[PDB]
Design a protein around this ligand. Structure first.
Ligand SMILES: CC(=O)Nc1nc2c(Oc3cc(-c4ccc(C(F)(F)F)cc4)ncn3)cccc2s1
Ligand code: NA
Lengths: 537, 119, 86
């Protein structure tokens, strides 16, 4: 319980009391404090600390090297390192759990992590502590990746260690070096393709809430690994797909332009050469439609998107799906004897053409443009649209009330006046479009006020804000594009899951170090050469 | 003073204008083919040709276009919706995009333009 | 060749070994190492160093004032400065 669950040790250690623990364990102190206190539970709503059920966890989350050394090297009761807590976190899991993203916390967390690992190595050198799982199912790496901790991930993937006595547990196995040049082999064991949660699979298919989802792909091996995959086997496939889609749109446009016009919908087939080509075109178009619909359904049913990330983490997918939906509705109408299918087909064709921009992500300098237009169709344009709509509606209803038409005559309808003011907005309007009014002064004053407030004031305001936003978000757009490219590389490699997988495996099977057991360390390493002129050691 | 101007116009005829031209061309072609499909001309009459409609949309772009240039269509709602969507996406969104990017590029490359002129 | 053309001096100096060269040239050390090793060739694709065929070049490209002074002011075999490479 809260204070019936807190053993002497928890609150004991809490106040940095070495002497007290000395005594308490000299006589004997239990090291299995099942503190589930609402204060000390995982519950985030409760203001407290999830240092960990076990007391070693409490010593660790706090900057106490002495106690973390002592509790484990104390003559007896060296609390079992593989101590699954309520949620399952081992000591390292808790250490990752507490870590924040501030620099000082980076120092603290990484520094401790290393030392605890080496102590565990010495203690019982058969337990692979970094693979122990948690309730949800996640290794320490998986957690650092999902929750989002730049520092911890950086350390683990660049975890270079020394003191050969036991150095198997490292990442950056250095190789031949000759002057200012030096090779280097990374590990890439649980990064690319294996387990149930790879690092490069939880950094991309992750919600937008995770902090710096788009900044963790610059660590060290991830970046070059993705680019090596791209330059080798995910370049030709993407271009061929682009070609196929561009051909499909052309066939659809050809089928649409030559639509027969004579009679109500279901149209019989002639026996001319052209009429067969038309039917073929129609069949291909509907096939494309069904394909896209099923793709959308699968996407939505497997990677469940939330209501907020619906339009923040999936924009291309939604548009693909909606285009497919319009196509299918057109088809269902066309067979029901209704000539309203032209509208659905037209909308489908327009959106299909505008959807080519999904392929700009293969080229560096246009993906940025596409992402920028995305951001400012969700950031800057909506607000301006709303305010301008209020202005237009107000002035249009005013003028329509003023107009008389008791005699360019049917200008009473609100629609006509609204259209005239919009025409004012697009630089074609007329300042004397009607004369039926009864007071010229009021009409001119309203028109001039509208022109001042919308044409000259709001539009230049929008230009100013767009300039400011651009100068703010150039870099953010770049990063978003990088993440988008990573998404597509993963998707393309997966899509051939059934076709082939062997060739789709980066790295090379190297063997550099050895294990304390006395065996080899067969690891899939990947070279990254470097040159330095100041280290010189 | 003027060599810098010439070099700047070169840089932005090889950097900024090409991309905008491509994207705008995609938009124009898509909406023009959509509208041309919608049009009927089963009765300002020979508006079936793709060329005439493309020219009309470009006229929209240069601030002279007309929002009721033809009446042969069969559904007014669809025609107006397409025209308004085009106007929102090209006239008000992309052009001010290009203004913003041109300003940013100028602020970035004043010095580069000077150096290129010296060379 | 790569390691057959690599003379004792090249790898010798490489590790900042004064004493060693002292001895090696005290008895005598050739200063005409024709190291054309793919690693040590002008080839940029090969990750290595083009410090230069002769070993004085190796001493020079690396921050070794001592050896560049020595190899030329050593009692004998002051490697011909005008030593055209490959
Ligand atoms: C797979 C995919 O689309 N990727 C991307 N598309 C775009 C983009 O294109 C659009 C087009 C439309 C649209 C809406 C309605 C209509 C109609 F009038 F027909 F109803 C037509 C078009 N809305 C939003 N975006 C603009 C900017 C960035 C990107 S990224
Ligand atoms: Na104008």
């Amino acid at each position: 319980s809260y204070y019936k669950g807190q053993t002497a040790l928890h609150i004991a250690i809490e106040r940095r009391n070495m002497t007290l623990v000395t005594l308490l364990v000299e006589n004997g102190a239990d090291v299995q404090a099942a503190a589930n206190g609402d204060f000390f539970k995982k519950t985030k709503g409760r203001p407290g600390f999830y240092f960990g059920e076990l007391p070693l966890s409490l010593a660790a989350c706090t900057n106490q090297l002495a106690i973390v050394k002592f509790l484990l090297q104390n003559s007896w009761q060296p609390a079992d390192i593989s101590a699954r807590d309520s949620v399952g976190n081992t000591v390292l899991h808790a250490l990752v759990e507490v870590a924040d993203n501030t620099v000082d916390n980076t120092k603290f967390v990484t520094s401790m992590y290393n030392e605890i690992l080496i102590l565990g190595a010495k203690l019982h050198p058969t337990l692979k502590l970094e693979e122990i799982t948690n309730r949800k199912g996640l290794t320490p790496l998986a957690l650092a990746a999902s929750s989002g901790k730049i520092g911890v991930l950086a350390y683990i993937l660049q975890r270079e260690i020394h003191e050969p006595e036991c150095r198997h547990l490292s990442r950056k196995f250095t190789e031949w070096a000759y002057g200012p040049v030096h090779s280097s082999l990374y590990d890439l064991s649980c990064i690319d393709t294996c387990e149930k949660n790879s690092v490069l699979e939880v950094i991309a298919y992750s919600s937008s809430e995770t902090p710096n989802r788009h900044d963790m792909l610059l660590v060290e091996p991830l970046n070059r690994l993705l680019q090596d995959k791209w330059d080798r086997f995910v370049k030709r496939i993407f271009y061929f797909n682009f070609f196929v889609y561009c051909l499909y749109m052309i066939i659809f446009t050809a089928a649409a332009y030559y639509r027969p016009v004579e009679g109500l919908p279901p149209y019989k087939l002639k026996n001319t050469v052209g009429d067969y080509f038309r039917v073929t075109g129609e069949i291909l178009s509907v096939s494309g439609g069904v394909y896209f619909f099923f793709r959308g359904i699968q996407y939505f049913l497997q990677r469940r998107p939330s209501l907020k990330s619906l339009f923040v983490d999936s924009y291309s997918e939604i548009l693909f799906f909606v285009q497919s939906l319009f196509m299918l509705v057109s088809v269902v109408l066309y067979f029901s004897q209704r000539k309203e299918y032209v509208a659905s087909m037209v909308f489908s064709l327009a959106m299909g053409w505008t959807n080519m921009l999904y392929y700009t992500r293969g080229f560096q300098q246009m993906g940025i443009y596409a992402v920028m237009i995305e951001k400012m169709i969700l950031r800057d344009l909506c607000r301006f649209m709303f305010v301008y709509l209020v202005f237009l509606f107000g002035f249009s209803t005013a003028v329509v009330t003023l107009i008389e038409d008791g005699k360019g005559n049917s200008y009473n309808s609100l629609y006509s006046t609204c259209l005239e003011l919009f025409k004012f907005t697009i630089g074609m309007g007329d300042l004397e479009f009607t004369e039926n009014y009864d007071f010229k002064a009021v009409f001119i004053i309203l028109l001039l006020a509208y022109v001042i407030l919308t044409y000259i004031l709001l539009l230049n305001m929008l230009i100013a804000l767009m300039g400011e936003t651009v100068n703010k978000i150039a870099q953010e757009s770049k990063n978003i594009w990088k993440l988008q490219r990573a998404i597509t590389i993963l998707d393309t490699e997966k899509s051939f899951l059934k076709c082939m997988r062997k060739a789709f495996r980066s790295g090379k099977l190297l063997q550099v170090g050895f294990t304390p057991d006395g065996k080899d360390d067969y690891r899939w390493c990947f070279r990254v050469d470097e040159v330095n002129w100041t280290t010189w050691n």
